[PDB]
Design a protein around this nucleic acid. Structure first.
Ligand SMILES: [Mg+2]
Ligand SMILES: [Mg+2]
Ligand SMILES: [Mg+2]
Ligand SMILES: [Mg+2]
Ligand SMILES: [Mg+2]
Ligand SMILES: [Mg+2]
Ligand SMILES: [Mg+2]
Ligand SMILES: [Mg+2]
Ligand SMILES: [Mg+2]
Ligand SMILES: [Mg+2]
Ligand SMILES: [Mg+2]
Lengths: 67, 70, 88, 104, 271, 129
RNA sequence: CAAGCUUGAGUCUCGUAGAGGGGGGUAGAAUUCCAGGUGUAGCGGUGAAAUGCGUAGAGAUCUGGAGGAAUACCGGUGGCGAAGGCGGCCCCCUGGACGAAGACUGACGCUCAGGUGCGAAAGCGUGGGGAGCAAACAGGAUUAGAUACCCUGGUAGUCCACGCCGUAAACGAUGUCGACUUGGAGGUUGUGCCCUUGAGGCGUGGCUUCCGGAGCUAACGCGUUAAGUCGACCGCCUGGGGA
């Protein structure tokens, strides 16, 4: 597709956003690869960091099952 | 993945949905590579061998459009 | 990596017009300041060899600049030596 | 000096001392000469995965322009505190005062 | 730091001397010093209860505080001194009121530091407050067995105890031997490890360095006589019996623990 | 590090002839202009010109005869590190008179044949055939 | 030898990307153990079985706790680094690299025997730790024989700190630096301009990937990052064994 971050001019990605960030994680808690998302390599490396921050702060689960 | 089946849903379609979810998650396909230890040397060799074929296919796709009508 | 204020102070102190910013006196002064700052850093992290190559390069560049200044006109070489406490 | 984006999740039961601890942290920052930026409380959001056998904590976020000494002071206070569950501290390129996506 | 010397003589060839430039190069504190009389392994009946003890060098005793009952009053540390009655060093501590005491020196301590004790002390190496207030996972030293008794656990040169649980009124600890034990929560402990962590690196070099410490040479039962030791006897280097003590008790393997009063505190035997 | 400007000039002109270029612009020099004068006099090149006030640039025009380049082989002789000095008797002859063996001496840098005619030796600069 | 210049080299100013290096913390999956609750005759493994684990409760599940390693997806002929090599996240110090527009010293530049430093893994010494894997070793299996490939255990070691060696197919089998030489299709990173209504359009630097012209080569093949033509320097080669 196209990089929506560049389309909307989103300079930085913050982990605090969840409603517009859940679209980049699969139902199993795995990150949607770039070949499927249609995202540039500049923003994929920032999306991964934001998702990791959210996982650390219990904003996005690592996987569907935890306990 | 949670595949809790609701009412008025056949077991056949429920099991097919569960199988499709497992396939898209790729959990079954990960054991065939996590069942043994791959050396970093072997992993890098496999990665380049897969990368070489992956654009060789596209190179041939873009090169076969010049001749060989059928 | 000296701070902007630290670099500006060295430029003002050593450059004649306060705008030279790159002669064989101000450059050597900045190199000496960086080496002295990194002395304690390496004395703490004695096993930072990757960051040590930059310090070695700075030492080599400073040695080349000092040799060039001595070959060109050795009065500012001597003045810079005692100003910076250069061993040689 | 440097800008940080501290956030922490505290226990849900003893969540009445959150204003007191926030006031104490702000007083410490001001005594350490730190220009406190935005400070928000997200309430008690249910945790995605439970931490220490509890499924919901209380989120507190604050951007602070304070020296690294008092930042380490705050980190140690978070580590030694018993009510707080987790604490995230990260450096920021520049001072940010815009509202968080949670409060929209 | 460990310093090895040149082989100028047999005895200096194989000796290293662990030194410390921060130790007080002078005299100890007289008001806190007492008399230490050596027994040489003799008891009130005159018999030799413990062998390989005698001689050595004259030593004094320094009153080291282990209870740490000064609550609410901070104190500073003046200097470190070598204690011949133990393997670690002793820190001289001066309180706000004017008291002077000897404390076990933590690893992270130096002249000019400040420490306190009580239920409101900060968590830094050198302080002392109850294990109930001490957070779980802490590595402490000079741990008590009973509330207010003093201190008996992890008082050597390089020993430390690790807290792992706070179940109710009791807490669980791993000692240096690898043993889990339960202690009262109201007991006190000093944060951090001990100062002289490299005491074991020393080597004596000669029998003279051991005679200086005062341990007599050990004679071998196989070299003794049958009457003197069970292993003695024979027309040469011979042995036809299991290794046993001079009193018949088996040495290698046979456990000799019979205390059943404190079996409720031993979470797991050392291994 | 550019340690030989004459070799750079020879390489540039040889590559231009191979690639069938029209003009080869380069940073010029006094010796470069002196060599270009000899090339124009001998007809191996078509034209040379120095255009520049602060940084003079020589823009030589390549000469082609029926497709084949006029210059067959350009070779540096007295490269920096191996200097060649031959007297009048032992002055070189390139391609039995069909090529030039340019010689630099006291009376400027005219050519090998002119050096022999004047009776003075010198140092060999370039073999052009 | 002297007096000048910036085009070589270097500095400052604003920005950018990165698993670059060192030190300390924290989250999670999973494996292995410890104890308890359900739980009954099998479990594990292989081409086939067996050594091995089980009614002394094995395998399965749940609960609570202990310990070590690295961080599933991201993840790519993606990125960095002189080379070796680096991958959760955060904090502190710091090296290196690239870009618009500038200002500045003025050949201060390249190579370099002898020397210095770094340098995969394996190995050695001391002090720790050790979950999993796994030389040596034991047992089982195959084979005429198997001191091995198949299996169950299993120590050193692989994990940490401080020390020693400078060994690899340490490879791009292609030494370091400067200039020139048709083109096409990309990846990554920055900047300039035009109406940016959509990664619309035209340019412009650094790194990197695949074809491919001249040319070169014994040929495979290199081919603007050349193995095309030259310049400066170092190291190495002179039949195969012996070695
Ligand atoms: Mg003995
Ligand atoms: Mg007897
Ligand atoms: Mg005999
Ligand atoms: Mg005898
Ligand atoms: Mg016998
Ligand atoms: Mg190793
Ligand atoms: Mg095996
Ligand atoms: Mg066998
Ligand atoms: Mg080689
Ligand atoms: Mg070099
Ligand atoms: Mg090609």
């Amino acid at each position: 597709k196209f990089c929506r971050f560049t389309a909307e001019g989103v300079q930085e990605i913050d982990y605090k956003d969840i409603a517009t960030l859940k679209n980049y994680i699969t139902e199993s808690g795995k990150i949607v690869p770039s070949r499927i998302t249609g995202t540039r390599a500049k923003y994929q490396r920032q999306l991964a960091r934001a998702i990791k921050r959210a996982r650390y702060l219990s904003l996005l689960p690592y996987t569907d099952r935890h306990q | 993945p949670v595949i809790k089946v609701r009412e008025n849903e056949p077991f056949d379609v429920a099991l097919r949905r569960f199988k499709r979810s497992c396939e898209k998650a790729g959990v079954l396909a990960e054991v065939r590579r996590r069942e043994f230890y791959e050396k970093p040397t072997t992993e890098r060799k496999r990665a380049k061998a897969s990368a070489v074929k992956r654009h060789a296919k596209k190179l041939a796709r873009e090169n076969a459009r010049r001749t060989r009508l059928y | 990596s000296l701070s902007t204020e630290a670099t500006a102070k060295i430029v003002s102190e050593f450059g004649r017009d306060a705008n030279d910013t790159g002669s064989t006196e101000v450059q050597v002064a900045l190199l000496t300041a960086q080496i002295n700052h990194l002395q304690g850093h390496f004395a703490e992290h004695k096993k930072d060899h990757h960051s040590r190559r930059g310090l070695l390069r700075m030492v080599s560049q400073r040695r080349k600049l000092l040799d060039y200044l001595k070959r060109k006109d050795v009065a500012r070489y001597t003045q810079l030596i005692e100003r910076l406490g250069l061993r040689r | 000096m440097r800008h940080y984006e501290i956030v922490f999740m505290v226990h849900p039961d003893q969540s009445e001392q959150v204003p007191g601890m926030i006031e104490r942290y702000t007083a410490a920052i001001t005594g350490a000469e730190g220009k406190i930026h935005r400070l928000e409380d997200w309430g008690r959001r249910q945790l995605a995965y439970p931490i220490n056998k509890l499924h919901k904590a209380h989120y507190v976020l604050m951007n602070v322009e304070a020296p690294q000494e008092v930042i380490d002071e705050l980190e140690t206070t978070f580590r030694f505190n018993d009510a707080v569950i987790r604490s995230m501290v990260m450096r920021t390129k520049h001072a940010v005062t815009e509202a968080s996506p949670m409060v929209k | 730091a460990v310093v090895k010397c040149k082989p100028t003589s047999p005895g200096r060839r194989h000796v290293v001397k662990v030194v410390n430039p921060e130790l007080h190069k002078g005299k100890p504190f007289a008001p806190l010093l007492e008399k230490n009389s050596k027994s040489g392994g003799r008891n009130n009946n005159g018999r030799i209860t413990t062998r390989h003890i005698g001689g050595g060098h004259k030593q004094a005793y320094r009153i080291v505080d282990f209870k740490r009952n000064k609550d609410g009053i901070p104190a500073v540390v003046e200097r470190l001194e070598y204690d011949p009655n133990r393997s670690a060093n002793i820190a001289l501590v001066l309180y706000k009121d004017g008291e002077r005491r000897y404390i076990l020196a933590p690893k992270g301590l130096k002249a000019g530091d400040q420490i306190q004790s009580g239920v409101d002390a900060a968590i830094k190496p050198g302080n002392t407050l109850p294990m109930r207030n001490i957070p779980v996972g802490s590595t402490v030293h000079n741990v008590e067995m009973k509330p207010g008794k003093g201190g008996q656990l992890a008082r050597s040169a390089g020993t430390y105890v690790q807290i792992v649980a706070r179940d109710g009124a009791y807490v669980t600890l791993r000692l240096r031997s690898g043993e889990m034990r339960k202690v009262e929560a109201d007991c006190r402990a000093t944060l951090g490890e001990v100062g002289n962590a490299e005491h074991m690196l020393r080597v004596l070099g000669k029998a003279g360095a051991a005679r200086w410490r005062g341990v007599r040479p050990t004679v071998r039962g196989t070299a003794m006589n049958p009457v003197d030791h069970p292993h003695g006897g024979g027309e040469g280097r011979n042995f036809g019996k299991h290794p046993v003590t001079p009193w018949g008790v088996q040495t290698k393997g046979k456990k000799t623990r019979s205390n059943k009063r404190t079996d409720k505190f031993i979470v797991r035997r050392r291994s | 590090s550019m340690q030989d400007p004459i070799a750079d000039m020879l390489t540039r002109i040889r590559n231009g002839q191979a690639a069938n270029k029209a003009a080869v612009t380069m940073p010029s020099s006094k010796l470069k202009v002196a060599i270009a004068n000899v090339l124009k006099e001998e007809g191996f090149i078509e034209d040379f010109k120095v255009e520049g006030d602060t940084k003079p640039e020589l823009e030589l025009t390549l000469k082609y005869f029926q497709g084949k380049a006029v210059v067959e082989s350009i070779q540096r002789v007295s490269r920096p590190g191996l200097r060649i000095y031959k007297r009048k008797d032992e002055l070189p002859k390139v391609m039995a008179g069909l090529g030039i063996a340019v010689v630099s001496t006291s009376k400027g840098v005219m050519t090998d044949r002119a050096a022999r005619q004047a009776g003075l030796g010198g140092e060999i600069i370039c073999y052009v055939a």
